[PDB]
């Protein structure tokens, strides 16, 4: 896991404004979530061939579809896999008012076929420590909501939560992590999309997009579900199902 | 319904900043929603003795409690009714990502005892027209989230949705209504709290608090679930249960 067959290319432009186009296929765990009508509404991250992790406030149901292997949501001609969702597992500690514990697992009806462009991100272990100021990457089609249609990427630093609440106050909970406010927006990530940091040569899912600066401010950090606080729940779910 | 036994008093100060203290008991449909621990997290509005309407993004469950007849959440000595919730009815069209159709009904285990300070707000009929620029009232303990602890009130004008999206863009959906941005904040309403307009001498529930200006800006309108778009669902629910 965590080692794309097509290695990402991150320039300086990923560190300012709205980041930059990703190399096609270079974030192979990134998926698009499309409802019954084909409309792309969230992101998520493959963690093996049968499971996708995303955000609970996305409100995914089984009528929605996981789209894997995509790069250009405007293209008509890239080998992608539309995968049916058999069952949705919303983390029952999800607080829809605070959006704390904002994680949901999708179990696929049929397995995804991993390939150069489709494979798993590594999950952190519960105890991993992704220090404040670590450069990390969010990717997604988030700027679609208004405009590019190819996958974007942005490098942005993590914040400690003590430091993140100077921006969001008491909204920032324990199972949350923030990143950005360093002159680069975080709106390129979709709701439910990944925030990955490169530990031990392998990209690890550190956050799931929860909410962002209302104005896509380059001086306001984005807020993510802290994956370390929820990977035990992720594993127990996979173990029981 | 809609005719408080203790009539509200609204001065000019309700039209600027964060409004003003309400007359005790003067908004008798206002309730407080407290979780298993006694913590006040949402508002709602009694619509008869057995039912409370609130917002779905509140994520009320049956371990929560409806608190009626309150004014001073810091007081220890006002006749209030803590009422158990027998069953929660979330409007199934609730889109947790857009927060469109943001309505949920609570059915009480035992009936509330109506009184001078506890009684029903009127519901609008599906076809009612609450014109843009109508002065309306939001009430709640919303400024509790940081500070007063007695019920606040604010008079603020309605907006057409065409006009509301100049502030919130495509976020503003069809089953939503906005109000404010006239030099008075909307943060005094709790999530799930009421927005009432006085039609035919009777206060009518026109909105349920959905979300507000991140900064409690006096020039940004609040966003409400448009009750007219959802009262048919309200009535059919009550009819079947």
Protein architecture, described:
Two copies of one chain form a homodimer. Chain A folds into two domains: 16-27 and 121-228, Beta Barrel (Thrombin, subunit H), CATH 2.40.10; 28-120 and 229-239, Thrombin, subunit H (Beta Barrel). In chain A, 7% of the residues lie in helices and 32% in strands. Chain A contains two helices and 13 strands. In chain A, the strands form two sheets. A six-stranded antiparallel beta barrel of chain A has the order 8-9-10-13-12-11. Chain A starts with 19 loop residues before the first strand and ends with a helix. Chain A binds chain B through residues 41-42, 56-59, 95-97, 145-146, 169-170, 191, 214, and chain B through 41-42, 56-59, 95-97, 145-146, 169-170, 191, 214. It is classed as hydrolase.
- The count of β-strands of chain A is 13
- Element order of chain A: H for helix, E for strand: EEEEEEEEEHEEEEH
**Largest interface: pair, residues per side:** A-B, 15 and 15 residues
Q: Total domains of chain A, how many?
A: 2
The radius of gyration of chain A is 16 Å
Quaternary state reads homodimer
Identify the CATH class of the largest domain in chain A. Mainly Beta
Helix content of chain A: under 10%
For the biggest β-sheet of chain A, the strand order reads 8-9-10-13-12-11
Q: How does CATH name the architecture of the largest domain in chain A? A: Beta Barrel
PDB class: hydrolase
Keywords: Clustering, dynamics, data analysis, chymotrypsinogen, hydrolase
Assembly: dimeric
Entry title: Data clustering and dynamics of chymotrypsinogen cluster 139 (green) structure
